[PDB]
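Non-structural polyprotein p200
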Amino acid sequence: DSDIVESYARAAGPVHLRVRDIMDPPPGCKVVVNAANEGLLAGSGVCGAIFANATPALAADCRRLAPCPTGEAVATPGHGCGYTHIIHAVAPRRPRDPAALEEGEALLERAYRSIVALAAARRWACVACPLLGAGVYGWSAAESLRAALAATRTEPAERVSLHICHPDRATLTHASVLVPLEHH
Ligand SMILES: Nc1ncnc2c1ncn2[C@@H]1O[C@H](COP(=O)(O)OP(=O)(O)OC[C@H]2O[C@@H](O)[C@H](O)[C@@H]2O)[C@@H](O)[C@H]1O
């Protein structure tokens, strides 16, 4: 646990900020989150890395399940990507000029809430998760972390610990300063 920048206490469960590749499972995380699109298609970034390491049956399962509405999440088997299951969660694209912005912050928080409720229903205690929406969907790491730390305030039926993984130390340490700074 030397990769942990900070650990936050939240109703859902502890949220750990971890310097590591999403494809390098944290100890005890058998379930990973895909930062997915509504069509559940392979993309770049985290989605690319998960599909890159999986069988064709994953695309087949997604064909059966698509679309996953923005703000929602849906599970599939992992198909050899290194995890037993994948939670495909769909972040909104960041609205470029409000008021859609405040609407989109709620939808980003909802995506994280949807991950937690899903994991709780499957009795998955730990989940490895990227910073939803912080890649091509335009959010910053701090915006995505702030959303995760808000979403986890909603108490779930069973505790779920989010291990948030990003391979760049500076991105996470920076985000860990900006989150409290907003409230300062
Ligand atoms: N291997 C990786 N491991 C951990 N974090 C990663 C990795 N690759 C990217 N990240 C980071 O995770 C966050 C999410 O970035 P994206 O992967 O681009 O996901 P998102 O912004 O939500 O956009 C989703 C869209 O992009 C496609 O990958 C996906 O199919 C969908 O269309 C960003 O912080 C990104 O830098």
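thats it. The longest strand covers residues 31-36. The chain has five helices and seven strands. bye
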